[PDB]
Amino acid sequence: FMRTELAMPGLQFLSNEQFNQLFTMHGTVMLLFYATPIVFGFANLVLPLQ
């Protein structure tokens, strides 16, 4: 959604605050809800095995 909006100079389909929420939650989700929880996902996966 950020990419589609940023492809053109105008605000085609997003609003200023809707875009602002996107990188907050994208940055949040990807880091804290995908990247940090999956180190313990891999740890739980193989660390006892290893």
Binding site: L11, Q12, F13, N16, N20
Partner: protein
Amino acid sequence: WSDALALGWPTGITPEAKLNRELWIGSVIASFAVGAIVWGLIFWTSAFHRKKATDTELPRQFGYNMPLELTLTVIPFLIISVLFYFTVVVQERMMHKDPNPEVVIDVTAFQWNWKFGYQKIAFADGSFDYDGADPERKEAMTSRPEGKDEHGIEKVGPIRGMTPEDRTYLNFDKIETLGTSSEIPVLVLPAGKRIEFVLNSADVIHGFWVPEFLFKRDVLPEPKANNSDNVFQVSEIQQTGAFVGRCTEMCGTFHAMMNFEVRVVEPNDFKAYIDQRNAGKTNAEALAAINQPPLAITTEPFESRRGELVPQ
């Protein structure tokens, strides 16, 4: 070749910007050399395929090369130490803090636009008997004799005896080039002079960044109380003309709509502009009078409409 190798760094317009660009070119050259050698190593060890001629015999199975490890952990330290020395010498000219600025601009950045005060002007050649106002810096000391209770509390104030709604840290000036949502502010500066910027934020943190200054600073609400050196100087601005400037820290929803301009004009043009602003006139009127486009030519105050598909 330099422009392409700069990776889209604008050619600076100040001595500090030029020096920073040179440091960036050097550091990018070093980084590309390191990347080239490492990518060569990777694409050359990719030539160590499992050759079908490899019989039932596993590789050398060595690992554990102490001298090679020592060499490749010594050289990176040398590289980064050279880069650090260059960084420090360049940093030294990040804020020389010359106690004799040629023009001082009070840059106060509120929610979603800018305002420029022209706190003081003192040309080295001798001119501009001008100064900032500061009658309007009125405090908000909540030092009432008594509060809700009957006696005893005599509350002074939450923070250092004052209230968060203080705004005393802000400074105000006679000539204010306030930027409206439909009128991009154009701070006009004399060419060839030393320009100091005293940076402040009315409401929230955001960031003053003139991309062609090759330098940004974060206008914070109360930099003095936050141990932030908001005020920063620029030794000179060689090239004239209009240079875009942008907001480079989170301001709120309209963080992308805080663009401004820093129009560098000749010292005589600045004389005329400041005289005509002392006379009752707006920034656009003064620009037109000094025969320079009134509206920001590098950017527009684009639509206040929430977007394209909104029904007007």
